[PDB]
Amino acid sequence: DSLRPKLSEEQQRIIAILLDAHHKTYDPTYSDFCQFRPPVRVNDGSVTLELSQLSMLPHLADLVSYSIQKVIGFAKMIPGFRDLTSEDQIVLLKSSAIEVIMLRSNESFTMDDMSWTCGNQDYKYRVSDVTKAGHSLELIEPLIKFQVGLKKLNLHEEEHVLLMAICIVSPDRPGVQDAALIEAIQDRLSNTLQTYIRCRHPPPGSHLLYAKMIQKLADLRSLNEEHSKQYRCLSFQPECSMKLTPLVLEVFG
Numbered sequence: 001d002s003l004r005p006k007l008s009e010e011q012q013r014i015i016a017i018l019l020d021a022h023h024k025t026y027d028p029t030y031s032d033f034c035q036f037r038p039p040v041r042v043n044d045g046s047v048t049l050e051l052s053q054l055s056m057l058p059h060l061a062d063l064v065s066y067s068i069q070k071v072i073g074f075a076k077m078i079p080g081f082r083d084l085t086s087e088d089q090i091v092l093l094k095s096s097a098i099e100v101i102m103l104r105s106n107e108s109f110t111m112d113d114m115s116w117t118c119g120n121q122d123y124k125y126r127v128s129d130v131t132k133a134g135h136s137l138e139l140i141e142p143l144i145k146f147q148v149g150l151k152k153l154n155l156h157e158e159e160h161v162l163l164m165a166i167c168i169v170s171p172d173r174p175g176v177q178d179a180a181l182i183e184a185i186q187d188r189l190s191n192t193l194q195t196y197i198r199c200r201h202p203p204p205g206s207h208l209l210y211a212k213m214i215q216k217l218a219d220l221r222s223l224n225e226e227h228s229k230q231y232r233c234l235s236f237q238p239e240c241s242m243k244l245t246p247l248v249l250e251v252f253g
């Protein structure tokens with residue numbers, strides 16, 4: 001009884017652009033990782049030791065800064081993002097940066113051992129590594145829950161890039177000027193996503209995937225708020241900005 005409208009020429013183009021944007025901004029071999037400040041793993045088996053050392057912070061801060069640069073690159077290739085004022089472009093990028101990083105990290109996340117595997121042994125990131133970077137389990141546990149839940153959706157790469165774009169272009173972000181434009185750009189992306197699922201995703205017996213995808217966006221909202229709280233506490237540690245990057249400092253500070 002549910003209508004299945006075909007993907008329009010513009011919608012097929014939008015997907016093509018977004019897939020191409022992602023392949024230009026996501027290296028699945030993670031060959032740049034060795035250029036970061038080296039990962040250090042001291043035995044913790046302690047929140048006092050954690051903040052004392054912050055051993056994994058320089059590496060992960062470089063990982064996040066690098067990721068932010070890629071997201072910016074990805075955003076500029078999103079259809080519509082061009083038409084926005086640069087002031088609205090920054091607003092959207094700053095408030096969605098950590099959300100989109102959590103999204104795009106799912107391509108490296110594996111349910112083999114519940115880790116982010118970016119090769120090879122050194123660049124395998126477990127729960128203990130994130131703690132060693134000065135974050136508590138209040139963020140880390142729900143983050144893994146999110147990643148696992150997202151993995152089980154078995155998203156097509158077409159859906160994965162669309163979801164990242166919808167995430168970035170959000171009219172309900174604190175500080176937006178032209179919310180109607182952002183809403184129009186998001187509607188264009190959402191409609192393409194809704195059409196694609198009904199068209200391309202099998203069987204389809206339960207097209208209830210879209211509602212599950214919108215739920216993931218809300219999961220990101222609360223994760224964003226929790227990371228924000230924990231970042232503020234990390235920044236209280238003396239000589240902490242040293243371990244971060246000017247870009248990470250601007251986005252979260």
Ligand SMILES: C[C@@H]1[C@H](O)C=C(C#CC2=CCC[C@@]3(C)[C@@H]2CC[C@@H]3[C@H](C)CCCC(C)(C)O)C[C@H]1O
Nearest residue numbers: 060064067101102104105106107108116125130133
């Ligand atoms: C490069 C690809 C993608 O961009 C993200 C990846 C990742 C990852 C991550 C692996 C371990 C946890 C993270 C460090 C990131 C993603 C978000 C996590 C935390 C909460 C961010 C903390 C930031 C700060 C220390 C400044 O507070 C791997 C690849 O899939």
